[PDB]
Structure 1
């Protein structure tokens, strides 16, 4: 044995143009190169990428968001490259002061540039969500990916859009910066009296560390029974082999309760989406309904 992590030998054939089904063609670019570097881990083929209407709209809106922030970083950096790199972590795009509040009459140098970048981010992410749904339906596939992404959109909409509207201003929200969105996260817990008492914060970790436990254990399983070809996880669903029989038993013999091949993925998708599902609820209620989770813990209501 060799603990099947990397690959000893690399094989390669003609470029894989993928399946068709109802996927509009043409759009797939010419296949990219083959990177041997990645082939030791996973596949070596890059592309072909599909770029549609929402695809271009998304990539365009995202680069607009990327640049609108970076332009501001140069203004602070006196247009000097040396101080750009030095203070790079410290520049920040803060939202309008509370004196404004929802109103879009904030000057550029005092919050107006936030809403510009926020509008690009808002449309680029949802353009990508629409993209993750149309690629699922185009291949006549389940749409499980589009709903899991909605869970991550949930926390993101709560942080920057759902909660600022409920609070009554954008003075809240999140500023675009490296070291500054770290200080924001610190402050949020401080102002609300240790998010640790927030029961949904505590439930978010339990699922954040699910995800660490589950995917550490599941990846180790398939590698442990790769020797029976357990990586081919769909044909084992449609026709159980020993790779799945040994998989169910080791889980049974070690902790009692059992798991199947399709079953363990049902565990997997929820243990992940529950992180941001409970997270968005605990951040949305924070400040809107509960002012201080500590005191809430003292009364339970």
Structure 2
């Protein structure tokens, strides 16, 4: 369901709590499109030291891969563009070790691009905790981001450390990351027999289950001001009373307005939390999950 009529007023701001840095692009409004769905107001953003650290490093990572990509097509963009999907940047991969001193093309190139990848993401995590505590909210999104960081850390840093080879990490490239993934199945005896990958599919599926339900239930109970959620948490009315009964009378139970968000975060976090353990064992302890399996 989208907006019927759209209503604007003056640029909204709220707190930000720390140093007013939160001003970059105090304007934006995108009535045209965004307001039909979500909020028309774009901006402001809080760019602070960490913000800058991440964007600098994120662009540096991206551009490192960028210039390394260009080399593979020489210089010709007509070419570069068709082969954009097939280009890659493999670790060392050149297979041998975590031996650091390795050429730009055979090691160096990936290590320096991965040095930035590391810092963009890690500073950002830091940022999400700061902006949390500033407004007096604290950790929750940053709690959940660390599992995404877990799976990311597993596949690029931690597992290659354990298998003494940076060659174990996912290579930068669009189709390469699809093929490393396929081969990973293969050399470990089909990842369907890995009980954690089956559990991660249970949670990935589970998350599109839960949001398709959570979402649809507020959009059915918006009628009673349902979407306001926190007020219903601090004062229940018909919206949280009625949503409860829908699910109780359907499947036998239901969940408190604050509590279904405790269901929601947990179902999403256990997609990368589970998965990360899953790949941490694959290859370092279990090389064939089928066999492991057949011992059951």
Shift of 1:102: 1.0
The answer on whether the counterparts of 2:27 and 2:44 sit within 8 Å (CA) in structure 1 is yes
8 Å CA contact 2:244, 2:254 repeated in 1? yes
Is residue 242 of structure 1 aligned with residue 243 of structure 2?
A: no
Q: 1:278 & 1:112 partners in 2: Cα distance?
A: 32
Higher mean displacement: 25-34 or 244-253 = 25-34
| CA deviation string 1:112-164 (max 9, x = no partner) | 10001000000110010000000000000131000100000000000000000
Please say if residues 133 and 143 of structure 1, whose CA atoms lie closer than 8 Å, have aligned partners that are also in contact.
yes
Contact conserved, 1:58 with 1:125, CA < 8 A, in 2? Answer: yes
User: Could you tell me whether the CA contact under 8 Å between 2:85 and 2:174 is conserved in 1?
Assistant: yes
Shift of residue 211 of structure 1? 0.4
Task: Give the match's secondary structure for 1:9.
Answer: coil
User: Using the alignment, how far apart are the partners of 2:31 and 2:105 within structure 1?
Assistant: 45
C-alpha displacement of 1:103:
1.6
Assess if the C-alpha contact under 8 Å between 1:32 and 1:47 holds in 2: yes
TM-score where L is the length of structure 1:
0.95
Between 18-27 and 266-275, report the one with greater CA deviation. 18-27
Pairwise CA distance, 1:18 = 1.8
Aligned pair in 2 of structure 1 residues 202, 285: CA closer, same or farther (>3 Å)? same
CA apart distance, 1:12: 0.4
1:99 deviates by 5.2
After superposition, what is the alpha-carbon deviation per residue over 1:68-87, rounded to whole angstroms, capped at 9, x for unaligned? Answer: 11111110011101111111
SS for the counterpart of 1:27 is strand
Give 1:28 shift: 4.9
**Residues 26/191 of structure 1: CA separation in 2 closer, same or farther (3 Å cut):** closer
Q: For the Cα contact (< 8 Å) 1:225–1:243, is it kept in 2?
A: yes
Moved more, 102-111 or 13-22: 13-22
Structure 1 residue ranges without an equivalent (≥5): none
Check the 8 A contact 1:76/1:91 in 2, yes or no: yes
Q: Distance in 2 between matches of 1:29 and 1:57?
A: 19
Secondary structure, in 3 states, of the residue corresponding to 1:44?
A: coil
Q: Is the 8 A contact 1:32 1:46 kept in 2?
A: yes
Offset of residue 111 of structure 1? 2.3
Tell me how far apart the structure 2 counterparts of residues 167 and 21 of structure 1 sit (CA, whole Å): 45
Deviations 1:173-206 (A, max 9, x none): 0100111110100000000001000000000010
Moved over 3 A (4+): 20-29, 97-100
User: Do the aligned partners of 1:102 and 1:170 also contact (CA within 8 Å) in 2?
Assistant: yes
Question: How many residues were matched structurally?
Answer: 296
CA RMSD of aligned residues (A): 1.3
CA contact (8 A) 1:159 1:173 kept: yes
> Which string of whole-angstrom CA distances, capped at 9 and with x for unpartnered residues, describes residues 11-62 of structure 1?
0000012224456556654333444310000000001000010000100000
8 Å contact 1:35–1:46 — kept in the other structure?
A: no
Q: 2:50 touches 2:126 (CA, 8 Å); kept in 1?
A: yes
Q: Structure 1, residues 237-287: CA drift from partner, whole Å, max 9, x if none?
A: 110010111100000000001211001111000000000000000100000
Q: Does 1:137 align with 2:133?
A: yes
In the alignment, the residues of structure 2 paired with residue 200 and residue 110 of structure 1 have an alpha-carbon distance, to the nearest angstrom, of 33
Give 3-state SS (helix, strand or coil) of 1:109's partner. Answer: coil
CA 20–97 in structure 1, closer or farther in 2 if over 3 Å, else same? closer
Q: CA deviation at 1:101?
A: 1.2
